[PDB]
Symmetry: D4
Subunit: 161 residues, 8 copies
């Protein structure tokens, strides 16, 4: 039963959002992936948001670039926690994406992660850490993964050839 | 019949948007003023946008600050030209408002004006110029207003005491 | 009878402005294209602006980069609505272009669109939406185009291979 | 039992973080408030983080300004979801705070909220929504609070005098 | 005969440009002061620029804020050296003024000075140095003024009480 | 007799500064080119500045990148007008270069041009316009050059193939 | 014997630099305070730097704002470690000060601290730590001061009323 | 006996930090190189910092990118002077790296150098200048190196072919 949904504004955002899905495959977390555009498919955004709780979603990861309205508009139509990922734009290098997602007004929150693929991965890890509060097995797998990252750095202290 | 609607996300944006209305009072252009919140009242945003054409609007002036989603979400739900006004935010001084409104993707346009009260006035003036294309009287009133502004500067060339 | 004019500062801006012209070909909207430089051909800017109304232009789309004075100087010499498109500059990535076009003072408005090719396309769509207020046929073609974009996103929900 | 901890780098950040606590008072959510400095008390930061799970916390809200290392260093020492709030700095207006919290590398996530008091309130709301996934009463209290905010705007449509 | 002209877009810019004039009063350099608006009085801008040489000017100091088109449009209509002064704007703190003046394309130069009152003073000083190349008396008065500023700092080495 | 000097901080700045020299070759203006480093050869900077007037220089064009101290330090040791050109840096895209040259304090002025090759060319044109005030022949050649640029734009109005 | 010198460009920078001196008073470190202007007194800057070693200085703390050339020009004339403090400028809020000091090219280093009073205090502390490497008493006084700051935060965990 | 330590957050930072090590090889200064991650290996950061003095380190050079917490967290656990080098990040071009390292609060100082390879080299030179205060031989080698850089610029004044 998929407890987290990964949505994005364009299929072109998959370059970035695929990094969220990758973490879920490693940690073995069931998820739904879908393209929902705030500007090109506004009515689908509403229907999606309104039915998120019924479909069992406990966390939603939304990514978008430029005038990134996707994460914020989903959060306005549901009480399910929303995490936003700023996709790096061409002209402004993602600064516009970040400002559009992070500067939400009092009342409707969106947990924002880094700009780019690093943020997509982190959004996935954050959602996993949220689920892991009530999933001892996932909590254990997260623990092992984090130890693997640490150990890889510890067993390779010298960067020189 | 009001051909132009002035909307905003909060009653606190009125301190800025009131300058848009002041222009319409002077040019004698009927207008509707309303508070429509993209995040607090997402449903009303949809009904307002969907019925904008039937209600007779030919131009919509939407103001908002911070992660300003209001202008763009309206433009996504109607073919009525939308003009956005970035309200000056505390921390980022309206740069976040600007990027949220101006950086719209290909397909759903939003004509953006200056940050603050100057942009509010200009949104009204640009809307009046759009209407003036098919309104000879308004067109003439506009011409007279612009000559007044010009004349005022021409008859006060020395700024010194 | 061409009702919208697309002007630019250099022939090098065509890389971007050609995206405005493209929308007009799809929507079958007659238009005039011309290179008018605010700094290299200032007298032509004036003559062009002064005669825009007589030549039947109802909307003007001006694009420029760096110290983008073109859109704002045209708006100062005519009551015909002007839409500005910030061309992406090398050093500042279009931030200088944006600030030059959007920060107009009270009295002379310029509707600004996104930085780059997305803004050029949008300026064309905005001008089309303005004309469509008094053109039931164009309004219908705009409607079909917008439905085509939406449907393309709806019939391709999964971004995965 | 307090399921959420609110930490901050200085007692001077309380002017901002107090808005996070105000949300918990209204929603009736038990919380712990403490001053933990990443640079002045680095050892306490470690003990606090290491024992966060045993102490029963399911969400940590960390606020800080300038080179805001607090949120990230906590997230590095625990699997308990960390949400960061950038406190508005004097010179850079919170832009340095934002970048310090949001730009975390792949592996150690930190959900970032708006700059200032608005983000403090939203961190509390996001934390409450995370808990509300497994707390039907809190979930209902959240629903009621959000309807109150919506209703308030809907019954005050005209901002004018 | 006044060899230097000081122009500005608004009488409100005088609060900044008055520091340029103060320098000329001290150095005893004849100057002309006038309000020339690029957007409100575009025709006067042209006449002023076209006749600058015949009127005997050898340097023009133009100040403006926001989308500061004034300096550049003057430089486009005359071969008389133009020096621009960015006036500090409210929202963007003169960054928009700076970019509008400094980022001129190849062909039409504008020597830009600091933002605000410091740049106004320096525009006057740079103009005086240009004239001083062919004015031995002014050259000497400049030397004396600069030694006075130096001497003042040298005879007050301790800033403490 | 060379009346203008082109100096730079590194031989690597020639990629940009060569555009200043190019204008002088076209306009047939004698000039001196030299590498003077403010940080690597501080004593040579002083000797150069101190003897600029004796060597007959009437204008100095200095270019540098990053912490661009060259233009400002030359201006402090001479009354000969100094024009600064911000070389585009790698990390900050020339924003650091611009701020370092343009924000001079009251007393020591530096006329700043655009970032990059466009500014280098313009610095040369500005220096030429300064010399042309007392050189009827150069004034004529500048006039022809400007007409050639204008005419090239006028005889090529359509950017389309 | 004073082993550390605190210089600044203006007596107006004292409002910031006084915090560097306050640290030395508390740690009982002999220091010299002086106003040395890079632009108004370029000759004194050279004599000061050249004789810094003979005068017994082992660390130099230089503060300046705007186009802050002071720190770098001193570092160019001496091998005595220079630490720079960016003074908060009006318009750009110290960003220009930061870039002028921090972006030094390869060869001539300048250790840069925070913008404003916080950086002034830290320059003093960093200087004291450098001296403390060969001064056991100062080293101990430093240890005691740091424990005092830590203890203060540890014995005031609750910021609330 | 190695008196300076070069640490970094990833082995990917070696592309930049290798420029610090290069200066030390030229100047023949013994040094230790190691990968210490603030987020992936937080406990190693503490152990490293705590034992820096015992291992004889008199200066520590730490480099990191993005949310660069490494330099600041080391400085919090030791009195050994820390120098920070901002590694150039992809999205924000190192601006996030700079803000994360330089904006330390009062009490814990980190001497910051330029963004990129130029800062890495300079951090090494600054650490060498600190050691050279009590090493007449190193002081002499630094002196020769600096004269070699100056002379190379002096014997190649003309940048033209
Ligand atoms: N569009 C929107 C939806 N929910 C909040 N806003 C924006 O929040 C800003 C100020 O927030 P507030 O009034 O709540 O303090 C206003 O400009 C308004 O557009
Ligand atoms: N986390 C931390 C550790 N040492 C200082 N801070 C941060 O420093 C900022 C204000 O600086 P100060 O305490 O020196 O006044 C606060 O936002 C606080 O988070
Ligand atoms: N050059 C110009 C033409 N029309 C307006 N300005 C600029 O607008 C700024 C302030 O606008 P306002 O007069 O509306 O307050 C001034 O700096 C002035 O240069
Ligand atoms: N370095 C320098 C040389 N001449 C002026 N400054 C700088 O100018 C700033 C303030 O400008 P002013 O002295 O004109 O008021 C101060 O921070 C000072 O460092």
């Amino acid at each position: 039963g998929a407890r987290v949904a990964i949505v994005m504004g364009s299929k072109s955002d998959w370059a970035t959002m695929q990094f969220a899905a990758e973490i879920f495959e490693i940690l073995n977390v069931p998820h739904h992936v879908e393209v929902v555009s705030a500007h090109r498919t506004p009515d689908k955004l509403f229907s999606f948001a309104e039915s998120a709780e019924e479909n069992g979603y406990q966390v939603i990861i939304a990514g978008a670039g430029g005038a990134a309205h996707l994460p914020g508009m989903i959060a306005a139509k549901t009480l399910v926690p929303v995490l936003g990922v700023p996709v790096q734009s061409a002209a402004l290098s993602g600064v516009d994406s970040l400002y559009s997602i992070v500067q939400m007004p009092r009342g409707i929150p969106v947990g924002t992660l880094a700009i780019g693929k690093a943020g997509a991965a982190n959004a996935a890890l954050l959602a996993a850490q949220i689920l892991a509060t009530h999933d001892k097995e996932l909590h254990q797998r997260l623990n092992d993964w984090r130890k693997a990252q640490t150990d890889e750095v510890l067993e390779n202290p010298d960067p020189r050839g």
